[PDB]
Amino acid sequence: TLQFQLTLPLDVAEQEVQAAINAATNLLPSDLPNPPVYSKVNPADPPIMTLAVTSTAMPMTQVEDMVETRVAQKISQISGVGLVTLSGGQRPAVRVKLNAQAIAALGLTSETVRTAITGANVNSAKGSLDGPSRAVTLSANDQMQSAEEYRQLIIAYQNGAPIRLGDVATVEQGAENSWLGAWANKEQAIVMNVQRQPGANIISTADSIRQMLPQLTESLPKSVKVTVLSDRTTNIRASVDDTQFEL
Amino acid sequence: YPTIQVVTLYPGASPDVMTSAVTAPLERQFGQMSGLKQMSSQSSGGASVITLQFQLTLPLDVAEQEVQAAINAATNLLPSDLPNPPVYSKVNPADPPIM
Amino acid sequence: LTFSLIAVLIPLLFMGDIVGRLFREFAITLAVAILISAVVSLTLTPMMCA
Amino acid sequence: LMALTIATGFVVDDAIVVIENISRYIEKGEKPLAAALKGAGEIGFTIIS
Amino acid sequence: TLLLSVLLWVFIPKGFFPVQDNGIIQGTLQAPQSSSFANMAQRQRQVADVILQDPAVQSLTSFVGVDGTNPSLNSARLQINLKPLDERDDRVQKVIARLQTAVDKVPGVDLFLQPTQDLTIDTQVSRTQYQFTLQATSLDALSTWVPQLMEKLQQLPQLSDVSSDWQDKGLVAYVNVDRDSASRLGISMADVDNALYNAFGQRLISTIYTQANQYRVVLEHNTENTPGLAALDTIRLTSSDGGVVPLSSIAKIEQRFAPLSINHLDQFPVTTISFNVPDNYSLGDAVQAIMDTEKTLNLPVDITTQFQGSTLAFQSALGSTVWLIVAAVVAMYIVLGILYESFIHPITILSTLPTAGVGALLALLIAGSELDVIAIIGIILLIGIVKKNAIMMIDFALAAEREQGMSPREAIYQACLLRFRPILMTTLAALLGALPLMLSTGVGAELRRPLGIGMVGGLIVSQVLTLFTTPVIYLLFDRLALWTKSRFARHEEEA
Amino acid sequence: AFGQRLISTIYTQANQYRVVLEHNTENTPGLAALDTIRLTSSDGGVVPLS
Amino acid sequence: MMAIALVVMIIYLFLRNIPATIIPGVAVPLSLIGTFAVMVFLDFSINNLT
């Protein structure tokens, strides 16, 4: 949290924070998953309207994948969105479960499986061919998408018996971080929050996302029901119409 | 018009691997940024140029700030064999050359 | 006529979009030419003709 | 919103003072156009004051 | 006049911006899917030998290869140049026609000329007359349903020359490394990828540092000694046992089909479709034809459409026009009421405006000139001049009526007699001002040539109607003013 | 072992998934899950953290 | 230049007033050349539209 003097314009402060975060990059730890990003958000700014998405009979990982592929981006596509914060992010990923006793029994370390997995999925340049008649591009099945091909990889060797990932470890589709989640009233759900844009009308934007609210619900799979829990255009309407009536 | 062209040339890579390893990450990074009205990409063999057209209300300087921030934030996920980092261009197609 | 003529150009310069911007220059150029011509007509010609 | 709500009275006050002068020159029974002109002339300074 | 104003405004063809002949033509060269550098270069050399033979062309500029502009390896963009105005003999249309029929005879080639413009709004350079996009959800589904929209949408007479930038018949070579066979010699997928990339990847590995410049070191393999795809299996790969293991023993080679370019729209695969509309049909017939085709083809429910260009510009113009006209007319009423301090006098002035529109639209239909927005502006200036001379007569009419107190008919008679000479000097000035635009034959003339004829028609029609209609219609408006005074008296009497 | 470490990457047609490493704690409850981890050695065997 | 020249010639021939002939050939170039003076504060650029 940095609070500046009243005389500093926001653009110049953004320039200094960008310069500092760039200059301090070398000293940062080298295992950072994402570089640090700045936010031009003051605590005084309130959100515009919050949307929460829940489901009944389909795993939450695919619910989150589905919502941030189609629901979140199309809603954010129109103006009126400052920053969509998908709180409780259960982002989909691939998990590998290690059995301590089994792997310890065969005398092999986690460095071995680490090296095998690192050397399995590498999607780099493969180049192209040139000749007098035809030209082609080289592409190989070096990329695996789902979990069965990761499971089928061989990660260790021991007296002739092929030791794979599946027979000594478990892999199953899940979340990238088990410690992020959201709860809606009594059931579990995924919640995203919409910020505001300066100089933008709020009532019209809310009416717009209301108008595209049903278009997504029909588009969503039948097992998914989306709901809204909080807003402020209703209090704005109450204030303006009460003032009008009084005058 | 507010229109930013960014170019990423990486030799040898086939078009499909170029789309999977270059366009997808920055496209997901650029899409969450405000003001984006529509986007289109020209992805071919060893080439990846991105076309972003913004709303009429966005000043060019602020759009340059967002594209710089996005290209900096998405740097880690980019392939590590990039010969040059991707550079943005403040050029609209309406501008003609001089000579 | 000087005041009434601008009434045609009073709304045109306020239209937005690319067409509005590209006609803004034409509109105010015409307006400035008309105003300067009016000032020259009421200032120089009376003296030359007097 | 609250600024406009309070300023309703301020805005109405100007109509109040002009109707005040015009009613003053209407009640006694002076010539209509002459009464309105003379009243506007005599109290135009006060309103701008 | 009012009825024909509405009828002609509906009848006249419209235009967005006009075409200009500056002297450059940008064309695109298309080559088969199996094209390479040697073949495309030799074809460019042959075309350059063919196009330069024309007398009107003076130079060629052509750059190919992977860059930020060119779309693919086989796709070549050409920038043609022409001699200036005073030396060649034909204009853009006939020169480009001769250029197009010159290259068609050349075997094995096809080149799409579009004359470039100066003011560009679209983010892309169009190839044919019109273009549009089709949005789907996945690469494979739209790829597999590409042939349907060529083999079923081509037969509509209103829809001709169906084409798209996407071609899905590109030749690609696939190597399938066995996961189980790799673990025997201690080789991983990383080694296979590194070997293939540093073998045929044009990989940049080392750096050269000099005093002021910075050179690079590049690794490449020879293909001349062994032609064909038999150059791929001559590469070796390291092994834990220390020997060299051939790629034949650990992998197999297959040939398949992949696309040369992937284009995306709104984070979903897309196709850009360009074509030519018959002159015997309008864009409405074309879009309704696209509607019934996309309905009849039974396309997957995940196939949507999106359009750009003329439709959006024309819809925006229609949305802006009505509000512009209404606000303008309100503005003239307000200022004219300020100038005359009356109710029906501005309506008398406002009643003469539409007369010039009839002349302008009749002239533009007769002159066969495109109704660009510049033509609309010219009609606006015509109406402005018409209102200018109208005010010129009405001011003196009102001044005479207020000064002499003579009856209105002889008042307007005297006003017209004393102001007639101003009418003809103004008309002559307008005619000489519009004369250069009529005979504009030089550079940029496409942006001034129709304006002269339009303004001249507007002026002569407007004066012909004015000099013979204004006084009596003004007297009729004065009679209507007398009746409105009667209405004021009534509304003050029985109401 | 117990860091929820993100190591590998998954590349797809349009999205980008990640690969995460985690250990089981259900089989052995309590802090006795920590000493079941092994560490490599120059001699080639496994040496316990105890 | 030809527009101004024709205007001057037609004025001289019509109203047969040499004084009425000296005014246009100096006033119109003076107004048109001097028009951009107010345009300086507007900072617009002369182009094809201008």
Curated annotation (Swiss-Prot), chain A:
Keyword terms, alphabetized: Cell inner membrane, Cell membrane, Membrane, Transmembrane, Transmembrane helix, Transport
Keyword presence, Iron-sulfur: no
Record localization: Cell inner membrane
One GO location term (cellular component): plasma membrane
GO molecular function, one term: xenobiotic transmembrane transporter activity
Induction remark: The mdtABC operon is transcriptionally activated by BaeR.
Domain of life: Bacteria
Protein family: Belongs to the resistance-nodulation-cell division (RND) (TC 2.A.6) family. MdtB subfamily.
Subunit annotation: Part of a tripartite efflux system composed of MdtA, MdtB and MdtC. MdtB forms a heteromultimer with MdtC.
Summary of the function given for this chain in its UniProt record: The MdtABC tripartite complex confers resistance against novobiocin and deoxycholate.
Full protein name: Multidrug resistance protein MdtB
Organism: Escherichia coli (strain K12 / MC4100 / BW2952)
Gene behind this protein: mdtB
Parent-record interval covered: 101 to 347 of 1040
From Swiss-Prot, chain F:
Induction profile: The mdtABC operon is transcriptionally activated by BaeR.
Superkingdom of source: Bacteria
Compartment(s) of residence: Cell inner membrane
Stated role: The MdtABC tripartite complex confers resistance against novobiocin and deoxycholate.
Subunit structure: Part of a tripartite efflux system composed of MdtA, MdtB and MdtC. MdtB forms a heteromultimer with MdtC.
Family the UniProt entry places it in: Belongs to the resistance-nodulation-cell division (RND) (TC 2.A.6) family. MdtB subfamily.
Protein name: Multidrug resistance protein MdtB
Lineage: Bacteria, Pseudomonadati, Pseudomonadota, Gammaproteobacteria, Enterobacterales
Shown segment, full-protein numbering: 744 to 793 of 1040
